[PDB]
């Protein structure tokens, strides 16, 4: 019954222009034994054809097209609802090159395990070969990839999340380099066996081979485990490429801010989860003459331009956002982006009229079908209607505040890099670094609340493709070798400081634009602030609070730098620097010592 690649349907009509790609596909098909092989072109006719099959399989239902055109709901296996960090591996030749923030396994050992798993794993399934490009196609060094997958759901979501299909394939030419990404849901089928809507396995691996730029995923059909352009490529593999090639692959939103003089400023901002990252990416300023547009709300690739400034591009093509908490009152621009349709929703609730709902959304629906397919009742049912990690997957081009520069292969010049977290105490609303190296330290020691303070350096803690210490050195290196005058200024922001009684000292949301105005003014040297031990921090009088009904004392408290509180912060930072291990750069330790000295 086992078939040689050549006789597997689809391989006789495969594109032969790129032999390297073709040989790889043949090798994989020989191993996984799919029923047939399909090379995807990303066209509209293909998209609708795959969606018809997804509806037929029960993987998708078609949502009411009067409310969301060309849109679908998928409900997953309850065992397969999120990225699985404990099953995610960086398989560098040496363990030190994965480092303490990463899960390592010897690559020989990993390949033996996974090749065994892949054997026969696609029986009874179509094997898709999915070409894609990360970033605009017109780039100087376009970062290409091919994902092989046995998941039709994956193909469709990749079409939205990346520039998928024909254009990318042509960009590969006859022998062009591309990232080899391999994926299987790990659920082979017997002839005539009825499938389930969401196949998956109990056994999962999401594995990265940094030297060869390869990604192997098995067992999950969900999000970042399976859509391999998203975290696996754009952050983990890309950070390794960036390390070797002199640029930066970062977990940052890209925001365009326009002042009343009609000048544009671009910011790249890194936050961990639960810090309102998406609300900031789609900010609506609350002060006259200030406007904001987005270029991305997740990943940013930054590369020095010929003028010596840092330029950012969004390598992605779609949004893959957490649905619960998204609503009209707090993020109408996200709602409007979704309202335009062409969206795949996963694990949200279904309204009686074929619309969608999730916790946080307006409407107080009286009855819903929940993410498990069960009846749900308002102010009664004690379980969430939508899964807390449920998602919308929607084209970026539908965003009403999308910046026109979003598809420019040259990217946009970054004036400021922001780092942020949630801190009840200690860390002020906004701080500016003293210089680049201090900036690196501020990013490297980014703390955010946990059940107590978690360190999430540059918000890359679960996404680094190599040793965290070498990563810090890489940041130091790029700044050291640059024109200092053209480097982005670095800021840390804490929207979430609290009074002793638990009040929020800063109202946040749209009012965050007032802090961004200060940042712009600092960049233009039009604003002051206090020199504190931790950097430049504005006083209340440095901020535009006009029109804002807020207690000035609360804002003052939000901005306070208390030496005693910061002395308490020191040993937390120290233990983190120790955890970073033998590769911790002296330049980062230097900044710790300078801080400790300034505090006295
Ligand atoms: O889902 C995501 O984008 C994450 O966890 O950062
Ligand atoms: Mn993210």
Curated annotation (Swiss-Prot):
Involved in the gluconeogenesis, in growth on fatty acids and is important for initiation of infection in the macrophages. Catalyzes the GTP-dependent conversion of oxaloacetate (OAA) to phosphoenolpyruvate (PEP), the rate-limiting step in the metabolic pathway that produces glucose from lactate and other precursors derived from the citric acid cycle. This is Phosphoenolpyruvate carboxykinase [GTP]. Keywords: Cytoplasm, Decarboxylase, Gluconeogenesis, GTP-binding, Lyase, Manganese, Metal-binding, Nucleotide-binding. It comes from Mycobacterium tuberculosis (strain ATCC 25177 / H37Ra). Pathway: Carbohydrate biosynthesis; gluconeogenesis. GO terms for cellular component: cytosol. The keyword Ligase does not apply. GO terms for biological process: cellular response to glucose stimulus; gluconeogenesis; glycerol biosynthetic process from pyruvate; oxaloacetate metabolic process; propionate catabolic process; response to lipid; response to starvation.
